[PDB]
Amino acid sequence: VGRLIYTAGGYFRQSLSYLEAYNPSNGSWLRLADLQVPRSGLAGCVVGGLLYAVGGRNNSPDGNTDSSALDCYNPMTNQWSPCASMSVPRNRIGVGVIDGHIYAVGGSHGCIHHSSVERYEPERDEWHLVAPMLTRRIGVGVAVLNRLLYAVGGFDGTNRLNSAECYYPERNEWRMITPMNTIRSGAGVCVLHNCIYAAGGYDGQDQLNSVERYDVETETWTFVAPMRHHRSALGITVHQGKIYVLGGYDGHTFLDSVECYDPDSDTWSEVTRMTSGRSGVGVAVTMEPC
Ligand SMILES: COc1cc([C@@H](CC(=O)O)c2ccc(C)c(CN3CCOc4ccccc4S3(=O)=O)c2)cc2nnn(C)c12
Ligand SMILES: [Cl-]
């Protein structure tokens, strides 16, 4: 059975509870069980075929509540189940999975911009802090390559960042890597082949269409073809060797545009529209439901 791209949550006028799944094999969207609590600025990931929604904030007519929540969606049952909450609320979070564990990276709680990082063990339903990043980062992009965790760009409370760093699990240690050529907060960050991609983002002045990638072997960042749309706070994932970017904000519109990147041709193509424009979604890929 094929795999779908799931988008959870996001923001349009207020934080959203939508869970919808796109099937690249046939172009279809399915609306699935809503999140129990609306949330924007969350991240999605998958472990053991389960979809997890991590952190965010409920920006609603009746207030703004940063989320420490971890919730688990089972495609086999179409149900959300609460898991243990994180140590702290983390809005505009990034996450990465290594060796079946979820790393929650940075994000904000009110005016607190976190450098802290914590790790979730599904088999124990427990979170534990690990070493903090060298830098406070909200709107941080996170990717995993070769069982190493990367935190890329973001906003430290004062400046948006071109900096990036790498976490070495067996040393419980963060070290800076080569900075990007572009300042990016709320970029989409993912991995494809031996490269970390950083797509779009916000630099304090503009939403960006540029895309660059870090080759871990050469330790250098290189720009590739820009996206068709400028976008910050986009969702990003990889499905069958291609990068998909979903939604985001372009300084004018909350985008419904979904674009995909073919690395072999260095081209971006429009592939579908989300059912409604939105930014700050969580995105991941897993099996079709039921
Ligand atoms: C301060 O303005 C901005 C901040 C960010 C950054 C944070 C920063 O650099 O200060 C950012 C990064 C990541 C995420 C998820 C967000 C929040 N989302 C985008 C903004 O839209 C809203 C608005 C209200 C609630 C939630 C959202 S969001 O879609 O979750 C911001 C991105 C922007 N893009 N355009 N503008 C005007 C931006
Ligand atoms: Cl926000």
Curated annotation (Swiss-Prot):
Q: Which GO terms describe its cellular component?
A: actin filament; centriolar satellite; Cul3-RING ubiquitin ligase complex; cytoplasm; cytosol; endoplasmic reticulum; inclusion body; midbody
Where does the source fall among the domains of life?
A: Eukaryota
Consequence the record notes for mutating residue 92 to M:
Impaired interaction with NFE2L2/NRF2
The reported result of mutating residue 185 to A is: Impaired interaction with SQSTM1/p62
Q: In its keyword annotation, does this UniProt entry include Coiled coil?
A: no
Q: Which GO terms describe its molecular function?
A: disordered domain specific binding; identical protein binding; RNA polymerase II-specific DNA-binding transcription factor binding; transcription regulator inhibitor activity; ubiquitin-like ligase-substrate adaptor activity
Q: Does this entry carry the keyword Ubl conjugation?
A: yes
Main localization category: cytoplasm
Q: How is it modified after translation?
A: Non-enzymatic covalent modifications of reactive cysteines by electrophile metabolites inactivate the BCR(KEAP1) complex. Accumulation of fumarate promotes the formation of cysteine S-succination (S-(2-succinyl)cysteine), leading to inactivate the BCR(KEAP1) complex and promote NFE2L2/NRF2 nuclear accumulation and activation. Nitric oxide-dependent 8-Nitro-cGMP formation promotes cysteine guanylation (S-cGMP-cysteine), leading to NFE2L2/NRF2 nuclear accumulation and activation.
Annotated knockout phenotype: Early postnatal lethality caused by abnormal cornification. Mice survive until weaning and probably die from malnutrition resulting from hyperkeratosis in the esophagus and forestomach that cause gastric obstruction. Defects are caused by constitutive activation Nfe2l2/Nrf2, leading to constitutive expression of phase 2 detoxifying enzymes. Mice lacking both Nfe2l2/Nrf2 and Keap1 reverse the hyperkeratosis phenotype and are healthy and viable in normal conditions.
Give residue numbers for the modification (S-(2-succinyl)cysteine): 290
Subcellular location field: Cytoplasm; Nucleus
List the residues marked with site Sensor for electrophilic agents. 111
In this chain the Kelch repeats are located at 4-49, 50-100, 101-147, 148-194, 196-241, 242-288
Q: Which residues carry this modification: S-cGMP-cysteine?
A: 111
Mutagenesis or variant effect for residue 207 to A: Impaired interaction with SQSTM1/p62
Q: Which GO terms describe its biological process?
A: cellular response to interleukin-4; cellular response to oxidative stress; in utero embryonic development; negative regulation of response to oxidative stress; negative regulation of transcription by RNA polymerase II; proteasome-mediated ubiquitin-dependent protein catabolic process; protein ubiquitination; regulation of autophagy
Keywords, A to Z, come to:
Cytoplasm, Kelch repeat, Nucleus, Repeat, S-nitrosylation, Thioether bond, Ubl conjugation, Ubl conjugation pathway
Family as reported in the entry's similarity comment: Belongs to the KEAP1 family.
Its function, per the record, reads: Substrate-specific adapter of a BCR (BTB-CUL3-RBX1) E3 ubiquitin ligase complex that regulates the response to oxidative stress by targeting NFE2L2/NRF2 for ubiquitination. KEAP1 acts as a key sensor of oxidative and electrophilic stress: in normal conditions, the BCR(KEAP1) complex mediates ubiquitination and degradation of NFE2L2/NRF2, a transcription factor regulating expression of many cytoprotective genes.
The record's note on quaternary structure and interaction partners says: Component of the BCR(KEAP1) E3 ubiquitin ligase complex, at least composed of 2 molecules of CUL3, 2 molecules of KEAP1, and RBX1. Interacts with NFE2L2/NRF2; the interaction is direct. Forms a ternary complex with NFE2L2/NRF2 and PGAM5. Interacts with (phosphorylated) SQSTM1/p62; the interaction is direct and inactivates the BCR(KEAP1) complex by sequestering it in inclusion bodies, promoting its degradation. Interacts with NFE2L1. Interacts with BPTF and PTMA. Interacts with MAP1LC3B. Interacts indirectly with ENC1. Interacts with SESN1 and SESN2. Interacts with HSP90AA1 and HSP90AB1.
Domains: what does the record tell us? The Kelch repeats mediate interaction with NFE2L2/NRF2, BPTF and PGAM5. KEAP1 contains reactive cysteine residues that act as sensors for endogenously produced and exogenously encountered small molecules, which react with sulfhydryl groups and modify the cysteine sensors, leading to impair ability of the BCR(KEAP1) complex to ubiquitinate target proteins.
The name under which this protein is listed is Kelch-like ECH-associated protein 1
- Which stretch of the full sequence is covered here? 324 to 613 of 624
